[PDB]
Amino acid sequence: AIAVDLTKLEEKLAPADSFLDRHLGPGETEQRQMLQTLGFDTLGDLIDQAVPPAIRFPRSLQLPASQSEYGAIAQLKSIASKNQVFRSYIGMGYYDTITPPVIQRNILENPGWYTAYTPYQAEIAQGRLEALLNFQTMVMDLTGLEIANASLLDEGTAAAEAMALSYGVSKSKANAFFVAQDCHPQTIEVIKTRANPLGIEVIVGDHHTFSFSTSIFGALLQYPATDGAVYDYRSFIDKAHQHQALVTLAADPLSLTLLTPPGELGADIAVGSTQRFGIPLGYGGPHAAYFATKAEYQRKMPGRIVGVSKDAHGNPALRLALQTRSNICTAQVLLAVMASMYGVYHGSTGLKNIALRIHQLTVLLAIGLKRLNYSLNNDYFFDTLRVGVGEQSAPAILKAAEGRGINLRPLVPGEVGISLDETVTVQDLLDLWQVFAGKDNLPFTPEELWSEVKTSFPADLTRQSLYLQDAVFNQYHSETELLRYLHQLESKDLALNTSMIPLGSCTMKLNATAEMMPVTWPEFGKIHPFAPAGQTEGYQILFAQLEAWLGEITGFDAISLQPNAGSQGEYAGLQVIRQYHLSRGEEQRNICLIPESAHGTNPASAVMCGMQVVPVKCDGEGNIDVEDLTSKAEKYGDRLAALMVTYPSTHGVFEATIGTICDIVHRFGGEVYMDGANMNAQVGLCRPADFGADVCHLNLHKTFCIPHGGGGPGMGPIGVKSHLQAFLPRTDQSIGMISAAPYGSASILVISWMYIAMMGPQGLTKATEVAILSANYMAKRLENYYPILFRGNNELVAHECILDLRPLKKQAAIEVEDVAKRLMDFGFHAPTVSWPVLGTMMVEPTESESLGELDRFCDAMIAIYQEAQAITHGEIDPADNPLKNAPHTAQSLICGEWNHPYSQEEAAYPAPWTKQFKFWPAVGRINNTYGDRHLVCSCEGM
Amino acid sequence: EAIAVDLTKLEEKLAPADSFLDRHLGPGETEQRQMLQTLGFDTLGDLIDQAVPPAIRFPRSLQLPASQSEYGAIAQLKSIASKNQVFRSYIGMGYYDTITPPVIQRNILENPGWYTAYTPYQAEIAQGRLEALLNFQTMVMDLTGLEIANASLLDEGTAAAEAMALSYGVSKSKANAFFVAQDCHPQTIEVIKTRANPLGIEVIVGDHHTFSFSTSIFGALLQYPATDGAVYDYRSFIDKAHQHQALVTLAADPLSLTLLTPPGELGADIAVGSTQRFGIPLGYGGPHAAYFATKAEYQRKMPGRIVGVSKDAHGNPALRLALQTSNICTAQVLLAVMASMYGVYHGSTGLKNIALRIHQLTVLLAIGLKRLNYSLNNDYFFDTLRVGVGEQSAPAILKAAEGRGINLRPLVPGEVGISLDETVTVQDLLDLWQVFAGKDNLPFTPEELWSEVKTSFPADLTRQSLYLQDAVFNQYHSETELLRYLHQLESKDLALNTSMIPLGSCTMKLNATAEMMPVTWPEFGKIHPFAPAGQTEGYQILFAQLEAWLGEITGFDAISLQPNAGSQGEYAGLQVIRQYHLSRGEEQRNICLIPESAHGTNPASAVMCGMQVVPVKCDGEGNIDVEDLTSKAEKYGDRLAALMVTYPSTHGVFEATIGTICDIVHRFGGEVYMDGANMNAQVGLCRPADFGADVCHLNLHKTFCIPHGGGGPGMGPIGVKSHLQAFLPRTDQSIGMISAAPYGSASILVISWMYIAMMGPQGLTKATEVAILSANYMAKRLENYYPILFRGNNELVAHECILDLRPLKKQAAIEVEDVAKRLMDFGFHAPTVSWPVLGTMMVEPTESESLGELDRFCDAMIAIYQEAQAITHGEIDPADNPLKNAPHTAQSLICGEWNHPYSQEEAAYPAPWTKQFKFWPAVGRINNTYGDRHLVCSCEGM
Incomplete structure (x- = not known):
């Protein structure tokens, strides 16, 4: 009424700063130029010809009008102010910690560290690869085990991965997995949820009294226990081994500075969270979980691993190793970097002093409570007490604590838990x-x-072995030293503060400062995920708005914000479809149709969900073969669980048959799951629920601006239709828990909230349309040099295109890898290489990159084409040329004798923009086969 | 409590916690012992006993609060900050809330790559900030319509005082009066009157409409728009002033100049103002860059620094400081960079729309106030209304406003002022x-x-000329574009995130993240300097604590936090001394004794204070000649105002005679002023007040961690003895105002508070001791290669040492400049060149740099010594060698033919560390003479 009058008045005013204009790369003049190149009169015409009219969303998205950066921040601050930052001594796997300011400012709040993605192009990612190598080394040192990976999603899912590994290396027919009843309860729920579709029996009970009478293939023990107790697990471990079972310890890595580590106890696997290595509570995340095990199990290790190799010059160089190896893809790289830097800054002595002080404070607390005549039940503990107070006093004690802004852990009636921490x-x-x-x-x-x-532990629990003895953990203890180390690592890595990284299937769009800012507000960052609801009303509002907005964007009736990666969203989606069929009395439906072009996470997720994967052929033009889909649906009619489809396709094509396809699946009793990684081609233009999807996931770290983090963190919320809503993960019928925290990595959800609030309905839709314009523009510019492999109706692509480089291989023996490395010399990170089609590149510019930048990338590809033609025409040595020898380090050009049939200038400055700003590749081409042959995954190798 | 002290004893029993001292210091205990052994001492305490004259040694511990951890100090300051109230202030008077674009806040204001370097003395490794400053000059020139502009002044009022001084210098008449319009901001008027007083300049303050020009004036200052908001046509006043041979300065709001006819077109001779509302936080007074623009004829008369376009050795364009009576040194570079980036990001259209919108809202506001029967007094205005309410209503309106968290400006009884802004x-x-x-x-x-x-102005006030038309203001409007532009400029500059910058007399120590963090808390950054006292109680506590602590460190009885540079401190100190002599009836005391080794700000300040400078000899050993001092003190006995002394000397030496020197000055009736720039050799070891100083200034941006900012901001608080306290600047007897804001750049004072709080008394003293250790260690390492020019008794230096490079000139025809440029190829910024002694370098490592870093710098100087020896011995061409051709760019090594008697590897990788991390000089050696000959100070030229 009055707001309406004001809103109308505001519209009369001179235009204010619109966030849309900062988020988009091409302005109106640049857009018109691109349309002219494409032969389209208007952007509307292009979009009307790109998107099949039938699936088109017929109205504006119902979302709040756009706000300025300043206004949206103010609105979110008001929301955040409703949260209460308590001193939470709740424990349960999350403990407050001090993020060193130098790490907060120069890593977490530095786009040089958070904007790049997975280190696919290792020669321009040596910085984060080194930080990950440090992470692995810290984990190996602390756990006492031989290999560790470059992070998993959270503690519970890492334990579930340990269950999976144990099942996979089992020698027996054992079908049961023992979980100690004093594991964190959310870990137990995550395990049960993962075991359910696989038919694995989970036995939950006291580890002291487990009979080993039912055969088990593995056991999980908590160290220290959820109630704080420290046990000597050696005899349990011995008996488990006598019964052919592997033992996993979920071990607090800070506690391991003092306690005998899993490796020395005889444990086969160790998992846990590195959250208390200076990572904010985050109301659940993001935090990097660790996974360590024996070298003999390296081929079964989940996730990614950094290995030490050497480059073309014989110099040490890092790369992702053993890539032939779970459905996990995006992990928690940025947080693993933070955790390893916490270890670098504190060193072995500093880490131990942090744990010693915590333990001393806990012993002191215990002594005082004893004098107050309370019963203390833990014989030995690290940071956590179990206090017997009696049923009558427990609520009053909890309430008094809350009166002082303190949360304790309710255990059982009459018992209260207290976990102390670095703060x-x-x-x-x-x-x-x-x-x-x-x-x-x-x-x-x-x-x-x-x-x-007495702060000592008995000899059998007292650690004697050393950790973090490598020079990297000793050399950078002054703030100035760490600042410089961070800076030198950062300078090796090509991130979005340098140039466009046009990775197909990744949506490397703007991660706006205003979107990132609230992540580190204490009102979001400092909340324990299991704090009482009365203290988290701001998060409640955040979730409700995000659920509503994402529901409107996807057309789905219900949204779950829990899954903490795309892989987890797929898995959660299939779990709910499975639960749906069971609820209908249709237990025999376990067939999952998957087109051949699908992301590898798809069939991995289906198998984890107990489904049998049946592939569906792609036709002559790369599209889903409808005849083949129909034939397989008919054949598996009684058993059809699901089709997993990506829309637009992983080929970057808007298939007009998508509705017909969903109808066929439903006709034969299946549900339709949509992989939503290509939602950047959809927002405001079409909605998955409207054309027949029953469920989809979204990658907030692709389409909705959560930063790529060097390979994590992400969020993978799912939308479902009403008939599936009853089964969503818990926040009689729920599938249980998919992530360890009820809202996964809650703190980073503010980024996508900010994006939606600042863009508004017209803004979000314009972003999609420009993403499509820019993809088509690059395809048009490059089509005469590299064939565009797949096109949709009207010869258009969607938000990405596939360039066929196979002719270059045929004509000049140039590999896709050669082109990828040569782009480094032009100052560019390669697009997506050899997926979904081997020997090709999939290019996705997004809407955030300017015409000048798109043209530079196209100009680089065209120059490389001309370099390849020189080889083809025999105008230069096919084995000794810039393509074969890329990337070219400064040292390779400046030092030693130059024996090449091309100039150093041709090598380093092949385009004019490189003479204005030169990005230097830090190392020469990395030998891949050598690194896999000789797996070295710790700092001892460098 | 009682209980409090008991908790203290308990805490001390715990395992050692993270101590900020160990992060601040570079060398740890082991490294210190190594350094001490090379010096022939077993302990640092024993070395310090020999370094500091026993007679002036502070005989006890500093009485300061025990050190707090980073986490604890942040929490304490946060509780203080929470006592401030962030209102919507429409007070105006020269400060207007503004929106700092988040991308600029994160990637400049919160990026040590931008704030840790100092003045761009070595241009080849400062092209990034030099370009930002060129953009700033261009922005100011375009908006003011004047021919040249500088690289910033301290604040608006002092810029206007600089304009007065320029006008006085160029006047040929006997005119002694300067007219100041009564509608200038009132703090501007007081700064002007305070500067005019010691020079005997008559300041006439009155209505510009009715000034008669009967009294001869040399200059006039007019406010545009006026302080009460009114926009006047100043053409006729300007014409009359010119007919009376006076220069006219307009203090002109630069945002208003997007709409209003600018000073240049009006016929104004000078324009000054603040660029604060180009996205710089209110900061409770600062820091903000002021501008100063004038006609080209007055260019050799311009105060401050100016960036000019020149060319490098290869003929390519390159920037440098050009044209090397004002005392200004440190300015406001970081904030000028921010303001220029605001211009780059918004562009001419964006800036104009911000101003149009503010003006439209102001017109709307006035129309509504009119409908409410209020009297609107401004015929034309930009953003500021003068509202007639009547005496009865004014208090109730102001209070009702405060009830909604709004501050208005009380103008006169019955009138209220309202200034709208970008927010x-x-x-x-x-x-x-x-x-x-x-x-x-x-x-x-x-x-x-x-x-x-009706938002139009009459034609005579309506601007038609264009501004910000250069490509740089058009090309970077997406967030991604600006991020990349910032990153490219940042990468050209060598700052403290790369390597030690051992600038003598500058104290390039750690600017710790924890110190910097609170600067951008809204409770400090978003407060108007003239907000009611009831809203600034947090700042009140901050000032009281800082005053007490700096009082204890210096031994002085009172502290003024007002002066906003060392130069301003000196000027304030001399003003207080002058007022003191006046208060005793001793008007004839105007002689200021100044040793010939003094920083050039000293005599400039003395002259601005109406004093006659008398130099004092420095002896053969480099020290103040006591016999000469005594003779001059005797000769000028009845007229002696002051001695300005630096302790330790500008040669880095603790003179044992300092107490005797003070006694002599006092004997002859003078006061002693101490330049406190070398306080990093003193803290905890001696106190100026104790050995006889009456007043000193401190450079908080040297000794106390405020970052160097690329050449500003600084703060220069003064400490005085009780007998001078009555005369301190206002926050019957005060000297008036030295800075425009009562606490100068108040928001950055939190940095020094944080440093003191985290260090504690033992920590602060240890820092001083390690700074002395490291300087002595470097001197000892280098003494056989470069003569150490001045040493104290016992052969030790203080916190810095002077390396004599003059023999290299005689032997190899190598200049200090050659060595300075060659250091760039080793990855180092040169130390202080040719001051205080021509042909030498003065090296100050500070306590924050590691032994490894000190050793790398010494090793570089030793390698350069050997390079010079090769020339001396005829082993390499005396004209074509790495020293003469430094710095070497990557392009100069890689492109074209290499015709040198040394290898490209010898040029770029002269030391092993450069092969671990290489810093590339962005340009070759810049031609200095060419630049001054052809003064080009705008983007038009490059």
Whole structure:
């Protein structure tokens, strides 16, 4: 009414700063130029010919009008202010921690560290690869095990991965997995949810009293336990081995500075969270989980691993190793970088002092509580006490704590848990004692307790082995030293603050500063995921709005924000479809149709969901073969569970048959799952639910601006129709838990909230249309040099195109890898290489890159084409030329004798923009086969 | 408490926590012991006893709060900050809220790559900030319509005082009066009067309309728009002033100049103002870059620094500081960079739209206030209304406003001022109307007023000329584009995130992340400097603590935090001394003794203070000649105002005679002023007040961690003895105002508070001691290669040493400049060149740099020594060698023919560390003489 009058007044005013104009690369003049090149009169005409009219969304998205960056920040601040930052001593796998300011500013808030993606092009990712190598080394050192990966999603899913590995290397027919009842309860739920579709029996009970009478293939033990108790697990481990089972310890890595580590205990696998290595609570995440095991299991290791290899010059160089190896894809790289830098900055001595101090404060707390006549049940503990208070006092104690802004853990009636952490001071101790005392004057003085403190553990739990002894953990302890180390690593990596990284299937669009800013507000970053609901009302509002907006964008009736990667979204989606068929009394439906062009996460997820994968052929033009789909649907009619489809296709094509395809699947009793990684071609133009999908996931780290983080973090929320809503993961019928935290990595959800709020309905749709314009523009510019492999109706692509480089191989013996490395010399990260089609490149510019930048990339590809033609025409040595020898380091050009049939200038400055700004490749071409032959995954190798 | 001290004893029993001192210091205990052994001492304490004269050694610990961790100090400051209230201030008076584009906040203001280097003395490794400054000059020239502009001044009022001084210098008449319009901002008037006082300049303050020109003036200052908002046509006043041989300065709001006819077109001779509202936080006063623009004829008369376009050795364009009576040194570079990036990001169209919108909202506001029967006094305005409400209503309106978190400006009884700004929304106007209406239901609807708005100005005030038409202001409007432009410029510059910058007299120590963080908390950054005291209690506590702490460190009885540079500190100190002599009835005391080794700011400040400078000899050993001092003090006995002394000397030496020197000055009736730029050799070891200084300034941006900013911002607080306290600048006896804001750049004072709070008394003293250790270590390493020019008693230096490079000139025809450029090829910024002694380098490592870093720098100097020896010995051409051809760009090594008697590898990788990480000089050696000959100070030239 008045808001309406004001809104109308505001529209009369001179135009304010529109975030849309900062998010888009091409402005209106640049857009018109691109349309002229394509032969289209208007953007509307292009879009009307690209998107099949039938699936087209017939109206504007119903979303709030766009806000300025300033206004959206103000609105979110108001929301955030409703959260309450307590001192949470809840524990359960999340403990407050001090992020060193230098790491917060120069990594977490530095787009040089958070904008690149998975290190597919290793020669221009040595910086984050080194940080990941440090992460692996820290994990190996602390756990006492032989190999570790470059992170998993969270503790619970890492434990589930340990269950999967154990099942896979089992010698027996055992079908049961033992889970100690004192694992964190969310871990137990994640495990059960993963075991269910596989028919694995999960036995949950006291590890002291497990009979080994039912055969098990593995066991999971918590160290220290969820209630804080430290046990000697050696005899359990011995018996498990006698019964042909592997043992996984979920072990707190900070505690391992003091306690005998899994490796020395005889454990086969160790998992856990590195959250308390300086990563914000984040109301659940993101935090890098670790996974360590024996070298003999390396081929079964989930996720990615950094290995030390050598380059063309014989110099040490890092790369992702053993890539032939779970459905995990995007992981938690940025947070693994942060955790390893926490280890670098603190060193072995600093880390140990952090744990010692925590343990001393906990022992002191215990002594004081004993004097207050409370019962203390943990014989030994690291940071966590189990306190017997009685049913009558427990609620009153919890309430008194809350009165002082403190949360404790309700365990069982009459018992309360307290977990201390790096933030705890002696003043916090006093608060706790006064809360338990029920009065401020205590029967002891704090200092007098110290003489009674024994902080030692028994010999059989006392660690003697050293850790973090490599120079990297000792050399960078001044702030200035770490600043410089971070800077030198960062300078090796080509990220979005340098040039466009046109990775097909990845959507490397703008990660706007205003979107990133709220992630580190304490009101979002400092909340424990299991804090009482009364303290998290701001997050509640954030979730409700995001659920509504993503529901409107996808057309789905219900949204789950829990899954913390695309892979997890797919898995959650298939789990809900499975639960749906069971709810109908249709237990025999386990066939999952998957087109041959699908992302590899798809069939991996289906198999984890107990489904049998049946491939569906692609036709002559690369599209889903409808006849073949129909034939297979008919054949598996009684058993059809699902079709997993990506729209537009992984070929970058808008198939007009998508509706017909969904009808066929439904006709034969299946559900339709849509992989939503290509949603950047859809938003505002079409909605998955409207054309027949029953469920989809979204990659917020592709389409909705969560940064690529060097390979994580992501979020993979799912949308479902009403008939599936009852089965969504918990926040009688739920599938259980998919992620360890109820809302996964909640803190980063503010990024996508900010994007939607600043773009508004017209803005979001314009972004999609420009993403499509730019993809078609590059295809048009390059089509005479590299065949465009797949095109849709009207000869248009969607948001990405595939360039066929196979002719270059035939004509000049030039490999796709050669072109990828040569682009480095032009100052560019290669697009997606050899997926979904071997020997090709899939290029996705997104809407955020300017025409000048698109033209530079096209000009680079055209120059490389002309270099390849020189080889073809025999105008230069086919084995010794810039393509074969790329990337060219400065040292390779400047040092030693130059024996090539081309100039150093041709090598380093092959385009004029490189003489304005030169990005230097840090190492020469990395020998891939050598690194896999000789797996070296720790700093000892460098 | 009691209990508090008991918690302290307990905490001390715990395992050692992360201590900020160990992050601040470069060398740890092991490294310190190694350095001490090379010096022939066992302990640092024993070395310090020999370095500092026993007579002046502070005999106890500093009385300061015990050190806090980074986490604890942040928490303490946060609780202080929370006592400030962030209102919507429409106070105006030269400060207007503005939106700092998040991308600029994150990637410049919060990026140590932009804030850690200092003045661009070595242009070849500072092209990035030099370009940003060129953009700033261009922006100022375009908007003001004047021919030249500098690279920033300290604030608006001092810029106007600089304009007064320029006008005085060029006047040929006997005119002694300067006219200041009474509608200038009142703080501007007081700064002007304070500067005019010691020079005997008559300041006439009155209505410009009625100034008679009867009294001869040399200059006039007019405010545009006026402080009460009114926009006047100043052409006729300017014409009359010129007929009376006076220069006219307009203090002109640069945002308003997107709409209003600019000073140049009006006939103005000089334009000054603040660029604060180009996206710089209010900062409770600063820091903000002021501008100064004038006609080309007055170019050798311009205060401050200016960037000019020149060319390098290869003929390519390159920037440098050009044209090397004002005392200004450190300016506001970082904030000039921010303001220029605001111009780059918004462009001419964007800036104009921001101004148009503000003006439209202001016209809307006035129309509504009129409908409410209020009197609107400004015929024309930009953003500021003068509202007649009557004496009775004014207090109730101001209070109602405060009730909604709004500050208005009390002008005169019965009149209220309102200045709108970039943050203002239609919702804010509604609040304003309701506050003035005294109720929420208005007799009009917001939108219905729009038909009445006439936002045009008369033709004589309407700007037609264009601005910001250069490509740089058009090409970077997407966030991705600006991110990449910022990153490219940043990459050209060598800052503290790369390597040590051992600039003598500059103290390039750690600017710790924890110190920098609170600068951008809204509770510090978003407060108007003239907000009511009730809203700034957090700042009140901050100032009181900093004053107490700096008082304890210096031994002085009172501290003024107002002066916003070392130069301003010196000037404020001499003003207080002058006022002191006046208060005793001793008007004839105007002689200022100044040793010949003093920083050039010293005599400039003395002259601005109406004093006659008398030099004092420095002896053969480099020290103040006590016999000469005594003779000059005797000779000028009855006229002696002051001695300005630096301790330790500008030669880096603790003179044992300092106390005797002070006694002599006092004996002859003078005061002692100490230049405190070398306080990094003093903290905890001696105190100026204790050995006889009456007043000193501190450079917070040297000794106390405020970052160097690429050449600003700084703060120069002064400490005085009790007998001078009455005369301190205002926040019957005060000297008036030295800075435009009562606490200068208040927001950056949190940096020094954080440093002191985290270091504690032992930490601060250890820092001083390690700074002395490291300087001595370098001197010892280098002494057989480069003569150490001045040493104290016991053969030790203080915190810096002077390397004599003059023999190289005699032997090899090598200049200091050659060595400075060659260091670039080793990855180092040169130390201080040719000051205080021509042909030498003064090296100050500070305590924050590691032994490894100190050793790399010494090793580089030793390799250069050997390169010079090769020339001396005829082993390499004396004209064609790496010293003469430095710095070497990558392109000069890679492109074209290589015709040198040394290899490209010897040029680019002269030391092993350069093969681990190489910093590339962006340009070759810049031609200095050519640049000054052909002064080009705008983007037009490059």
